[PDB]
Design an enzyme around this catalytic site. Structure first.
Site, PDB file in Angstrom:
ATOM      1  N   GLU A   1       0.816  -1.215   0.000  1.00 12.92           N
ATOM      2  CA  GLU A   1       0.000   0.000   0.000  1.00 12.92           C
ATOM      3  C   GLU A   1       0.853   1.270   0.000  1.00 12.92           C
ATOM      4  O   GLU A   1       0.573   2.235  -0.727  1.00 12.92           O
ATOM      5  CB  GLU A   1      -0.886   0.008   1.237  1.00 12.92           C
ATOM      6  CG  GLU A   1      -2.013  -1.020   1.192  1.00 12.92           C
ATOM      7  CD  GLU A   1      -3.087  -0.626   0.171  1.00 12.92           C
ATOM      8  OE1 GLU A   1      -3.116   0.500  -0.408  1.00 12.92           O
ATOM      9  OE2 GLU A   1      -3.900  -1.496  -0.068  1.00 12.92           O
TER      10      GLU A   1
ATOM     11  N   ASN B   1      -8.637   5.571   3.497  1.00 13.61           N
ATOM     12  CA  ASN B   1      -9.348   6.409   2.526  1.00 13.61           C
ATOM     13  C   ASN B   1     -10.164   7.501   3.218  1.00 13.61           C
ATOM     14  O   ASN B   1     -10.884   7.239   4.195  1.00 13.61           O
ATOM     15  CB  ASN B   1     -10.293   5.549   1.674  1.00 13.61           C
ATOM     16  CG  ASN B   1     -10.658   6.201   0.352  1.00 13.61           C
ATOM     17  OD1 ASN B   1     -10.481   7.358   0.167  1.00 13.61           O
ATOM     18  ND2 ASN B   1     -11.168   5.433  -0.558  1.00 13.61           N
TER      19      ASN B   1
ATOM     20  N   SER C   1     -11.432  11.376  -3.413  1.00 15.94           N
ATOM     21  CA  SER C   1     -10.928  11.029  -2.113  1.00 15.94           C
ATOM     22  C   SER C   1      -9.410  10.791  -2.180  1.00 15.94           C
ATOM     23  O   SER C   1      -8.821  10.683  -3.245  1.00 15.94           O
ATOM     24  CB  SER C   1     -11.663   9.782  -1.597  1.00 15.94           C
ATOM     25  OG  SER C   1     -11.376   8.636  -2.398  1.00 15.94           O
TER      26      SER C   1
ATOM     27  N   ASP D   1     -12.501   9.305  -7.454  1.00 17.76           N
ATOM     28  CA  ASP D   1     -13.695   9.943  -6.908  1.00 17.76           C
ATOM     29  C   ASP D   1     -13.368  11.205  -6.103  1.00 17.76           C
ATOM     30  O   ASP D   1     -14.266  11.801  -5.499  1.00 17.76           O
ATOM     31  CB  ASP D   1     -14.490   8.939  -6.055  1.00 17.76           C
ATOM     32  CG  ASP D   1     -13.653   8.279  -4.971  1.00 17.76           C
ATOM     33  OD1 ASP D   1     -12.641   8.856  -4.529  1.00 17.76           O
ATOM     34  OD2 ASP D   1     -14.008   7.172  -4.527  1.00 17.76           O
TER      35      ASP D   1
ATOM     36  N   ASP E   1      -6.071   8.542  -0.204  1.00 19.19           N
ATOM     37  CA  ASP E   1      -5.570   7.519   0.699  1.00 19.19           C
ATOM     38  C   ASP E   1      -4.356   8.037   1.457  1.00 19.19           C
ATOM     39  O   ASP E   1      -3.459   8.653   0.874  1.00 19.19           O
ATOM     40  CB  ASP E   1      -5.202   6.244  -0.071  1.00 19.19           C
ATOM     41  CG  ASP E   1      -6.417   5.530  -0.623  1.00 19.19           C
ATOM     42  OD1 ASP E   1      -7.539   5.941  -0.293  1.00 19.19           O
ATOM     43  OD2 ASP E   1      -6.251   4.564  -1.384  1.00 19.19           O
TER      44      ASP E   1
ATOM     45  N   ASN F   1      -7.601   9.332  -5.286  1.00 25.33           N
ATOM     46  CA  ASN F   1      -8.447   8.425  -6.043  1.00 25.33           C
ATOM     47  C   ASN F   1      -9.300   9.195  -7.049  1.00 25.33           C
ATOM     48  O   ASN F   1      -9.508  10.407  -6.948  1.00 25.33           O
ATOM     49  CB  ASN F   1      -9.361   7.664  -5.099  1.00 25.33           C
ATOM     50  CG  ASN F   1      -8.571   6.874  -4.065  1.00 25.33           C
ATOM     51  OD1 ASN F   1      -7.647   6.187  -4.393  1.00 25.33           O
ATOM     52  ND2 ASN F   1      -8.929   7.024  -2.792  1.00 25.33           N
TER      53      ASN F   1
END
Ligand SMILES: [Cl-]
Ligand SMILES: [Cl-]
Ligand code: NA
Length: 129
Positions: A35, A59, A50, A48, A52, A46
């Site tokens: 990750e 998220n 958002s 959308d 991380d 991301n």
């Protein structure tokens, strides 16, 4: 902070992740590797809108507040910036809530795709724990 493999394993064990909800420590180390490459300061945006955050790429759509993910939830009740600390306490406590919410560690796509079904104990081999 960029963790070493065993350093992180030891920190995660001290924070109660070994066998938390049935996931052996090697699953958590493997997830962190893919990750964030063990970097507490990792961020990724991301599609959308958002983002991380941190060593486990938590998220902002659900888990933390970054002030720029409209309509998002803050289920760990923390600013996302707290997840970037060299102290992993906030990231671990939030991961514990995520992994307990029903889907286990399938919430981490890199775990599902790169750790699940593999010999995850290799990630803690040779560490003094
Ligand atoms: Cl393990
Ligand atoms: Cl992946
Ligand atoms: Na720590």
């Amino acid at each position: 902070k960029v963790f070493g493999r065993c350093e992180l394993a030891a920190a995660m064990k001290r924070h109660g992740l070994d066998n938390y909800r049935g996931y052996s420590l090697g699953n958590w180390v493997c997830a962190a590797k893919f990750e964030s490459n063990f970097n507490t300061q990792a961020t990724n945006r991301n599609t959308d809108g958002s983002t991380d955050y941190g060593i486990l790429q938590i998220n902002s759509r659900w888990w933390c507040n970054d002030g720029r993910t409209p309509g998002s939830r803050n289920l760990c009740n923390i600013p996302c910036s707290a997840l970037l600390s060299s102290d992993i306490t906030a990231s671990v406590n939030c991961a514990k809530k995520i992994v307990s919410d029903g889907n286990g560690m399938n919430a981490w796509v890199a775990w599902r795709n790169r750790c699940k079904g593999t010999d995850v104990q290799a990630w803690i081999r040779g560490c003094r724990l």
